[PDB]
Structure 1
């Protein structure tokens, strides 16, 4: 598996990223806080999004054009995608009242950090553009990349807004939890930046900036991102917490989860009341009653059937829209999420 091999060489390159970013002695203490933010928050995940930049790059560029510099730009931009992710996560864990992330306590829960994490998160964002300028400003794709990262921020932040507006704290919400609202939320908050962004960045770096091709790519990747978020929702409640590295909050947080959307579609009137009285509250007793209703409605089996139908669907889409890009570009990614 192309992702599996590249992982260590990609992780290995992180020391250089920090080196170039953490280097005006007056702001010395600030750069030391930045490194500390980077070490804690950019490391520990699976790196699928940044690896996608490196894997798609190798697969799109002609070997005779994969020199040292060209390859260094590729994994620098992969690390830019990782930085964007770290930024999103640090801020989202505050807003979601999360406890752990990637197998350690959330950055904003660390004694001595707190709501300072808000500035820490935005520093991670700033680092993307620091890196693009340091390594890509003389490439013809400089502006394309800047605009693509900026639009991705906007996209996810618009998605996050939908997320929060559909999960008002303290408000029985069930009427809002529809398939159509769910699909919108995750298209913007997850699918664009987790799937379109890294393939698109690699495309631009390869000189593939045709609109039709990006649209065809996008068509594949947004549907992959939709399943990816549905899987995240499933894992929030039903995943092994020692594998996911994070504790679920969706029920307590009144989130428009794929699970609750599927519950409302299958719930008897009597079961709908169970949901209405227990969802979106902090009481452990009430959360557990939601989980029992899901398991009683066999949502774990409904997720299982959905993952296989969705897989076949993405596969159909790759056959439709991959050309002229190599199929492996999307099969590598799809293999890593299914």
Structure 2
């Protein structure tokens, strides 16, 4: 990833040139440029890069001409745009202030709820690019369907989340069956399955069974990834993470609170109930302490270990005939 990151970001400028070239609509296109530059840039690009890297592990290097690669870059960027769409819109729904410590787009002066359109444009740019760069490829329809299905799964996950945590404190809502379901639909499918699957299609690997196999490994990785973000949000060194966590404040249906609830004597249940999600820090400090007293960081470390054996068993069993390195590169990024 480290090398390839550079040429991935050089390509953006071109993604944009193309998306911004009927002159009556110039102003709108100017706006689109801003929206793209503000919202698609500034993350770590892990998802989009995954498309590119996996495309290289999957194609015999004699089928990686400069146009094959230009498409891999572009489709990686399609993943990033999809993400950008979700985030811009999620920030609005959450009433968030910052994203990656920068002002959320909808919070910029004179944008506001216009960001809903802007988010929709981001989504749309995915399908323009696919047409621009892949309309003639045999995997074209495969990729349209995959991006569409990934949007649907994500949106559904979002609904499930929204129902489950209404900003209305209800911890009967916060069960494990349900936590898992949210992670899977809202983040894992697009974060993990999507980018690999896209590379699979670009490589001619379109079998339903192959995709199902890759899916079984990749959704389980995504479940751990998110559980680890939940853990880190509260317990990560915040300069090593970058994030300074607001989960508890926010009534989030976090892995921490789920385990906590399986592990509460009633005295502990109507304490947690008197504390999950106030601005004031001593009520949030108090929760961190209930978690600490229940050795939740230990439950996690136990979880991280088991999860790691499980992912390697899954890779042993279901990678074939993809090179296991497709999966292992990702495992290394996440269990780091």
TM range (shorter): over 0.9
C-alpha offsets along residues 66-96 of structure 1, whole Å, 9 cap, x if unaligned? 0000010111000000000111111111222
Change in CA separation of 1:238 and 1:22 when aligned onto 2, cut-off 3 Å: farther
Question: Per-residue displacement from partner, 1:195-219 (whole Å, max 9, x unpaired)?
Answer: 1111100000000001110000001
- The answer to whether the aligner puts 1:272 opposite 2:265 as a matched pair is no
TM-aligned CA distance change 1:243 to 1:96, over 3 Å: farther
Q: Distance in 2 between matches of 1:300 and 1:44?
A: 30
Task: Rate the CA distance shift 1:46–1:279 in 2: closer, same or farther, 3 A.
Answer: same
User: In the comparison of the two structures, how many residue pairs are matched?
Assistant: 335
TM-superposed deviation, 1:145? 0.2
**TM-aligned CA deviation for residue 335 of structure 1:** 0.9
Report the more deviating stretch, 283-292 or 313-322.
283-292
| Inter-partner Cα distance in structure 2 for 1:244 and 1:77 | 28
Post-superposition Cα deviations, 1:208-251, rounded to whole Å, max 9, x if no partner, equal 00111000000100100111111222233333444555553432
Kindly tell me: are residues 87 and 222 of structure 1, through their superposed partners in 2, closer, same or farther at Cα, counting changes over 3 Å?
Answer: same
Measure how far apart 1:44 and its partner are: 1.1
Q: Is the 8 A contact 1:104 1:245 kept in 2?
A: no
- CA displacement, residues 161-200 of structure 1 (integer Å, 9 cap, x when unaligned): 011100023x231112111011111110111011111110
Supply the distance in 2 between the matched residues of 1:322 and 1:215 (Cα, whole angstroms): 11
Q: What is the distance in 2 between the residues matched to 1:195 and 1:246?
A: 21
Q: Give, in whole Å, the separation in 1 of the partners of 2:305 and 2:258.
A: 19
Deviations 1:28-70 (A, max 9, x none): 1211111111111111111111111001100111111100000
Q: CA deviation at 1:106?
A: 1.6
The change in CA–CA distance for 1:110 and 1:295 in structure 2 (over 3 A counts) is farther
- Match for 1:152 among 127, 131, 150? 150
Greater RCO, 1 or 2 (C-alpha within 8 Å, sep 6+) = 1
CA distance in 2, matches of 1:242, 1:118: 32
Point out where structure 2 has 5 or more consecutive residues left out of the alignment.
none
Counterpart residue number, 1:194? 191
CA RMSD in angstroms, aligned pairs only: 1.5
TM-score scaled by structure 2? 0.95
The TM-score, its normalising length taken from structure 1, stands at: 0.95
Distance 1:276 1:204 in 2: 48
Q: CA deviation at 1:142?
A: 0.5
- Looking at structure 1, the residues matched to 101 and 327 of structure 2 have their Cα atoms a distance apart, in angstroms, of 29
**Shift of the alpha carbon at 1:256?**
1.3
**Correspondence for 2:80:** 82
Q: Secondary structure at the match of 2:186?
A: helix
Q: 1:237 to 1:118 in 2, by over 3 A?
A: farther
Cα displacement (A) at 1:267:
2.0
Aligned: 1:184 with 2:184: no
Comparing 232-241 with 95-104, greater Cα deviation is found at: 232-241
User: Is the 1:99–1:246 Cα contact (8 Å) retained in structure 2?
Assistant: no
Structure 1's unaligned 5+ residue stretches are none
Cα deviation 1:117-145 (Å, max 9, x = unaligned): 21111111111001000000000111000
Deviates more, 1:319-328 or 1:257-266: 257-266
Structure-2 separation of matches of 1:298 and 1:19: 52
